[PDB]
């Protein structure tokens, strides 16, 4: 299956789930949501067979969409499954994007995790909030590594912004543990940002 074809089928399954949700057909909603997640997972594996990182990001976005739908119709089991899928796919995207020296897509993985965190915060799911927030912080740390290797202080700054957004979210959610992890991550990222700026600005002054 062409990965664009998998993605099209995944989107078709999402729309069935939406339509079923509207009708109050809970069984059909759950079957279509499951199928969308299954196809998103298949898209990740095909994207690997073909060496296409952008498609892994599209898979993650399918899972996010299933999670939002589930949130809206109050289905906690499908919400948690779709959230877990989105985070799992985000982690796969970091690994692919890191190998190809593509820090822009590593940042996109962090944005997926942040959106899961926001969804979980909105819906009062503390367990998923913690998972997604921790994932976002971990991806910010990998983004610093990737970005520093390419001498790109701008993407290091983006990693700082990810940590700061986790910090602010956690304070609003009252999650002290995640707050302190986010603040420590942000401190480390900002120290590495100073170093990377000074390294570049130094070799610029030199030349």
């Amino acid at each position: 299956m062409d990965p664009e074809e998998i993605l099209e089928r995944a989107k078709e399954s999402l729309e069935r789930a939406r339509e079923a949700s509207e009708r109050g057909d809970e069984e059909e909603f759950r079957k279509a949501a499951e199928k969308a997640l299954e196809l998103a997972k298949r898209l990740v594996e095909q994207a690997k067979k073909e060496g296409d990182p952008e498609l892994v990001l599209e898979a993650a976005k399918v899972a996010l969409r299933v999670a939002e739908l589930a949130a809206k119709n109050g289905d906690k089991e499908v919400f948690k499954k779709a959230a877990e899928s989105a985070l799992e796919v985000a982690k796969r995207l970091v690994e692919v994007a890191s190998k190809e020296g593509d820090p822009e897509l590593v940042l996109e993985a962090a944005k997926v995790a942040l959106r899961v965190a926001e969804l979980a915060a909105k819906n009062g799911d503390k367990e998923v909030f913690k998972k997604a927030a921790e994932s976002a912080l971990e991806v910010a740390k990998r983004l610093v590594e990737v970005a520093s290797k390419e001498g790109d202080p701008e993407l290091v700054e983006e990693a700082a912004k990810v940590a700061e957004e986790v910090r602010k979210l956690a304070k609003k959610q009252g999650d002290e543990e995640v707050y302190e992890k986010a603040r420590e991550t942000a401190r480390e990222v900002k120290e590495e940002l100073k170093r990377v700026r000074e390294e570049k600005g130094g070799w610029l002054e030199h030349h």
Side-chain angles (χ1 to χ4, degrees), residues 17-43:
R18 189 196 310 283
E19 176 209 331
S21 188
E22 294 163 11
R23 289 197 315 271
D25 189 339
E26 304 96 342
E27 298 273 31
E28 184 73 355
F29 167 73
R30 283 194 294 275
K31 289 196 289 195
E34 281 288 345
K35 188 58 175 170
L37 294 178
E38 181 175 19
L39 288 162
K41 286 178 165 168
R42 287 192 181 170
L43 177 55

Side-chain angles (χ1 to χ4, degrees), residues 5-20:
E5 178 169 356
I6 304 172
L7 177 59
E8 174 56 24
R9 292 197 184 186
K11 292 156 60 174
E12 289 173 14
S13 281
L14 172 68
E15 287 315 310
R16 302 298 146 258
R18 189 196 310 283
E19 176 209 331

